[PDB]
Write an enzyme that holds these catalytic residues in place. Structure first.
Site, short mmCIF file in Angstrom:
data_model
loop_
_atom_site.label_atom_id
_atom_site.label_comp_id
_atom_site.label_asym_id
_atom_site.label_seq_id
_atom_site.Cartn_x
_atom_site.Cartn_y
_atom_site.Cartn_z
N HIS A 17 0.74 -1.10 0.14
CA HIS A 17 -0.29 0.30 0.00
C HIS A 17 0.99 1.09 -0.09
O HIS A 17 0.52 1.71 -0.10
CB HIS A 17 -0.71 0.21 1.15
N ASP B 58 -0.09 -7.52 0.86
CA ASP B 58 0.19 -6.19 1.27
C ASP B 58 2.00 -6.05 0.69
O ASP B 58 2.35 -5.46 1.78
CB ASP B 58 -0.43 -5.88 2.62
N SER C 27 5.03 2.25 9.44
CA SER C 27 3.89 1.21 8.22
C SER C 27 5.26 0.68 7.76
O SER C 27 5.67 1.77 7.00
CB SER C 27 2.58 1.87 8.23
#
Lengths: 294, 294, 294
Positions: A45, A81, A161
């Site tokens: 992402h 992901d 992240s």
């Protein structure tokens, strides 16, 4: 020097900022050096928008020492992901030490590390709070997905992240994903996926043709069956309640999605189904989600 | 005795409840004794309403041992969310031990301590998750502001806002502010500000006359320039993208606000600007925000 | 083996999943084995719907080793969000070691443990952040309530509600309740309540007949007085500001609810009241909330 201060310091050089810009937009995330040739793992992402609009987005990798280097996309997998980047002819890369996520225990202490030079990059502390926990994940025209994940009570956010989840040996045991508990992709899945993306620029996952919702028999109730799908040829009907896929019991639709993915493509697999009060065991042969790369 | 239990216990006597009441309202926050003459540091939002409505609000300091003493406002700075109170002729004050926030490292363990007798006072644990992180802060007719802050994953809330952020030596390294990560004002800023508020009842900060918003060149884009402002006399125009103030690179408008404040008043300072694709270096001389006290 | 990993592992066998299902619904929570005869303590909201609809709900206890056993409800107390279950003729129960919550200190490290086999069961880490903190609690046609609780910055959620809060000796010091800080019912209240539920299937709490809201004199302002109530016979009037109940000062309505419950039924108790600027001390004799079981 504090106990966490030392571990955090020891991996800082392995964690990079990833930066995708255009004429009117910027994205920024974290990544980690996993290979001396210059391979960087991040989550899909973070780069999603650069990958779908390559004529308009540029991607850069900023290192701990402030150096800024162009990056190229090797491959990406929206279903886990994950994504792999590549920098060329950069010397003195400190490579992150990969752990073994099958040896992690509920209760171990962990650090969730973002890139030292990220705009709002964070480093947070907690424990492993659960293992093999399916979690759904939603930022572009990419598919939604579900991952057998490590759960932690260290905060996972935009600021870390894509960075690594770190054990007390300063070893990478997962990749943080922010796609108040946090989740990371276990490093052993990361290794399989990244290995396949570096070689082929793609990974192929099994598919069955089913859509499900969660159920009072409990499990994943079949909402739709694609025509021509393996599910059709195997006999699955709408309103069936899947309770087992392969040798994995299935608690809900989230665990259904994950259970299909650990099936072998083109091999027979048992599906266990509750159908109008009766228990039925079907046989399906999963198709690859992409037949040309297979 | 647990490791954190000991540190928490060792500072409890230095942390006080601060209580502002009127005929129809009450506020309550935490503060810390920083000086044996009876000086208490808290954050400006805790006392904001008492300071703006002094004919109607009374302020009390409740000590660890239950003693309740009237308090007087020495000075306050909405721009750093700091404030100083004063109690008179109180003996046996345990004064908090001030640390040095320039020696704190990402990863150090910290406690965020509220006053032991506060209604819902909390004591929470975490690590330092980032340093020199600009953060905006919004509870009265006071100006909004931005502070170069310490970030922590210890929870900061109403129950410990105004209390100290504490290292493992039981030393104050910052002031918690709640104006799920938390932020504190670093103790070294706290010392400068409090030193000036005790002497003069005021601090003077630099000002330039600019309003900015964040930017694809990245930075703080100029939205408005006051007439007669230092910015005008220095040549800054609307739509310019500030990328450097003094010797601080500027990532966004938040870091712009903080960078102006560490400039010297009435000295020439370079401003670096991207203007219609060209790079331009201007020269501005910051004005004091309050000319009489200067 | 990590320090928390060891404590978590050492209690896993004492923590069970509790599962209430019907034709169209399921609930799931955690519980803990507190007695070798097969007594399980959980919180009342986990089983609330099974208790109110017993002709349609079944309750099962799933043990650490995967065994699934039917369970029966011994008693429940919505006022402390506690409940007791019973399994019969199960051998080799590992019983949880009950601590003493009057020896816990602000700052001690704790684990909040959910059942190992719960769908989304969590294990989280933090410290004790406050003691004797009244907290209100809201999932059926059960009354709302308030509990003198232990506060912690370990996350408490659906995944560990009903499980134990654990000290570093692997001792139960409270019961987590999720009815970002968390709260648990202190083990010493848990013992009193559970002791009475095992013997009588009920506990009787004092009642006065008052409803209050919080207050600038500060405290719990009387909103309504039931006719015939102890409060009436004692002279309490609407608009009175209760500041003390028994020998407990009362900060707000939440602390009022808790203070009434630690009164003795049918004994005279002083109530301190501020009434039109004057201080008044009344005398009330609390009634039992359920006269037949008394």
């Amino acid at each position: 020097a504090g106990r966490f201060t030392k571990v955090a310091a020891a991996v800082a050089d392995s964690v990079v900022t990833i930066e995708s810009v255009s004429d009117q937009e910027g994205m920024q995330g974290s990544g980690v050096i996993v290979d001396g040739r210059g391979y960087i793992v991040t989550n899909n992402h973070v780069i999603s928008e650069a990958a779908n609009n390559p004529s308009q987005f540029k991607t850069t990798v900023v290192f701990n020492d402030g150096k800024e280097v162009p990056a190229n996309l090797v491959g990406r997998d929206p279903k886990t992901d994950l994504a792999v980047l590549k920098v060329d002819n950069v010397d003195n890369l400190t490579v992150a030490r990969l752990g073994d996520s099958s040896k992690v225990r509920v209760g171990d202490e962990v650090l969730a590390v973002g890139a030292p030079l990220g705009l709002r990059s964070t480093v947070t502390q907690g424990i492993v709070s659960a293992l093999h926990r399916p979690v759904p994940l939603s930022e572009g025209a990419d598919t939604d997905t579900v991952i057998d994940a490590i759960q932690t009570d260290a905060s996972i956010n935009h600021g870390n992240s894509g960075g690594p989840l770190i054990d007390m040996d300063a070893q990478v045991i997962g990749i943080n994903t922010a796609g108040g508990l946090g989740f990371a992709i276990p490093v052993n899945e990361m290794k399989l996926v990244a290995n396949s993306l570096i070689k082929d620029g793609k990974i192929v996952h099994p598919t069955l043709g089913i859509s499900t919702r969660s159920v009072n028999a409990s499990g994943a109730q079949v909402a739709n069956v694609k025509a021509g799908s393996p599910a059709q040829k195997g006999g699955i009907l709408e309103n069936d309640v899947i309770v087992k896929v392969g040798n994995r019991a299935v608690a809900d639709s989230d665990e259904f999605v994950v259970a299909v993915r650990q099936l072998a493509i083109g091999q027979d697999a048992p599906i266990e189904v509750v159908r109008e009060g009766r228990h039925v065991t079907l046989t399906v042969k999963p198709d690859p989600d992409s037949t040309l790369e297979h």
